Chain A
Amino acid sequence: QTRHVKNYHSRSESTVENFLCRSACVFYTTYRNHGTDGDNFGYWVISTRQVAQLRRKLEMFTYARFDLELTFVITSTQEQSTIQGQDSPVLTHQIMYVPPGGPVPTKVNSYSWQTSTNPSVFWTEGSAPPRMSIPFISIGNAYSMFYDGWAKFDKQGTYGINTLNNMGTLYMRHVNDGSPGPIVSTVRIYFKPKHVKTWVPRPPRLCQYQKAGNVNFEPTGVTESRTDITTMQ
Chain B
Amino acid sequence: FCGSAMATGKFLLAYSPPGAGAPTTRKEAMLGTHVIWDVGLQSSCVLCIPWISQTHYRTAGGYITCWYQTNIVVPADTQSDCKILCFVSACNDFSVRMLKDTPFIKQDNFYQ
Q: Which residues of A contact B102 (CB under 8 A)?
A: 53, 56, 204
Instruction: Flag if B96 contacts A13 (CB, 8 Å).
Output: yes
Instruction: Flag if A19 contacts B24 (CB, 8 Å).
Output: no
User: Given B22, B96, B99, B105, which contacts A52 in the complex, CB threshold below 8 Å?
Assistant: B105
Bound complex: CA of A11 vs CA of B111, how far in Å?
35
Bound complex: CA of A118 vs CA of B81, how far in Å?
67
B112 at the interface (CB under 8 A from A): yes
User: Given A1, A4, A51, which contacts B51 in the complex, CB threshold below 8 Å?
Assistant: A4
Q: Which residues of A contact B18 (CB under 8 A)?
A: 4
Instruction: Flag if A19 contacts B93 (CB, 8 Å).
Output: no
- The stretch that binds A, out of B5-13, B38-46, B55-63, B72-80, is B55-63
Give min CB distance, A202 to chain B, whole Å: 15
Number of A-B contacts (CB under 8 A): 63
User: Given B54, B94, B111, which contacts A211 in the complex, CB threshold below 8 Å?
Assistant: B111
A231 at the interface (CB under 8 A from B): yes
Q: Is the interface of A mostly helix, strand, loop or mixed?
A: loop
Interface members, chain A 19-55 (any B CB < 8 Å): 19, 22, 50-53
Q: Which residues of A contact B71 (CB under 8 A)?
A: none
B95 at the interface (CB under 8 A from A): yes
Q: Which residues of A contact B22 (CB under 8 A)?
A: 231-232
Among the interface residues B94, B95, B99, B106, which one has the most CB atoms of the partner chain A within 10 A?
A: B95
Bound complex: CA of A22 vs CA of B96, how far in Å?
16
Q: Which residues of A contact B110 (CB under 8 A)?
A: 50
Known contacts: A13-B96, A19-B99. The answer to whether A1 contacts B107 by CB under 8 A is no
Known contacts: A4-B51, A53-B101. The answer to whether A209 contacts B96 by CB under 8 A is no
| 5 nearest A-B pairs in the assembled complex, by CB-CB distance | A52-B107, A10-B95, A212-B111, A231-B22, A1-B56
Interface residues of A (CB under 8 A from B): 1-2, 4-5, 7-11, 13-14, 18-19, 22, 50-53, 56, 204-206, 208-209, 211-212, 230-233
